[PDB]
């Protein structure tokens, strides 16, 4: 039975950042757990906001507010910039 | 050890004038959210009516952009040394203006 | 009527809601109180 994980994507990012560096299995599992935890936190915050304002949709505005709520300071600023640029690039195509 | 270089000020001019006034950097002040430098009077006059950068339109601050401006002494010294006689001219204008209204 | 304290079994009157001797709060019907003030 197939069990999915973010291994290939994390490896692609690692090759993008450091061309000649590898990663071991324990660190791979650690990164997978980290990604899952951050995903669940952001999704929970967005769902809470959507229920909170009497709405039934989770949109980019809700995700942006959740990210700003969670990430501290410069991390939140850069994440917001990346999200907005990605959304503009995707919708202008 | 590098040598002594003779180069066009015209080739260097592009990175030395404040876009708000069109003249060379005088008492330079930089916004840090995009690292953009202008004249202090120019930028403070701009910030009283708008909250976005003159070039890339990035918001300097949510409420009080006056908190996000820093004096660029290094840039001011560099432009002073690049432009010949600029500091003497400015000093002369300061004394001339101050010699009439004490 | 009277009730018996769990801590010291004293026959305490109904009108009181603090035990006369050991000074421990009376408990609820289901859950009775437990060891309080471990020091004598």
């Amino acid at each position: 039975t197939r069990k999915e994980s973010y291994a290939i994507y994390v490896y692609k990012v690692l090759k993008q950042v450091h061309p000649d560096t590898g990663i071991s299995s324990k660190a791979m599992s650690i990164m997978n757990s980290f990604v899952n935890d951050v995903f669940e936190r952001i999704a929970g915050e967005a769902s809470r906001l959507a229920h909170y304002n009497k709405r039934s949709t989770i949109t980019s505005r809700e995700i942006q507010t959740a990210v700003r709520l969670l990430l501290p300071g410069e991390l939140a600023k850069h994440a917001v910039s990346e999200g907005t640029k990605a959304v503009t690039k995707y919708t202008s195509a | 050890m590098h040598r002594t270089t003779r180069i066009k000020i015209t080739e260097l001019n592009p990175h030395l004038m404040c876009v708000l006034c069109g003249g060379y950097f005088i008492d330079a002040t930089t916004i840090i959210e995009c690292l953009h430098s202008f004249c202090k009077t120019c930028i403070v006059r701009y910030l009283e009516t708008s909250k976005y950068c003159p070039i890339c339109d990035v918001q300097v601050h949510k409420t009080r952009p006056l908190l996000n401006i820093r004096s660029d002494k290094t840039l001011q010294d560099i432009v002073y040394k690049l432009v010949p006689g600029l500091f003497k001219n400015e000093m002369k204008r300061r004394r001339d203006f101050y010699a009439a209204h004490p | 009527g009277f009730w018996d304290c769990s801590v010291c079994t004293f026959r305490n009157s109904a009108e009181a809601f603090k035990c006369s001797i050991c000074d421990v709060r009376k408990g609820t019907s289901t859950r009775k109180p437990r060891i309080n003030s471990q020091l004598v």
Binding site: - | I7, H15, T41, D72, T74 | -
Partner: protein, 101 residues
């Protein structure tokens, strides 16, 4: 606060740009203090400027200094948390390349 214009600063006139075709002659030490890295004691390359104190360093120099420890400014001892407290300086890069190609 600390930004109110002075009496002269209210109406100072702009300085005209020199369109004359004259050359500037510069010794290799004229802008030494302005173009020398405080860490490697050499010229800048991929300039990183701090957000709080506007101090310029080499990217590798400052990254190694911050990673080693003492997360403060090597020049004015002001603290900086991580890489996000610095920004690249294309203006400085272009000016340096022009002055000393």
């Amino acid at each position: 606060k600390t930004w109110e214009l002075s009496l002269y600063e209210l109406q100072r006139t702009p300085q005209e740009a020199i369109t004359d075709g004259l050359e500037i002659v510069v010794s290799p030490r004229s802008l030494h203090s302005e173009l020398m890295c405080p860490i490697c004691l050499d010229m800048l390359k991929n300039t990183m400027t701090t957000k709080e104190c506007l101090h310029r360093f080499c990217a590798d120099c400052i990254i190694t200094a911050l990673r080693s420890g003492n997360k403060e400014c090597p020049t004015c001892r002001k603290k900086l948390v991580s890489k996000r407290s610095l920004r690249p300086d294309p203006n400085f890069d272009a000016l340096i390349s022009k002055i000393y190609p």
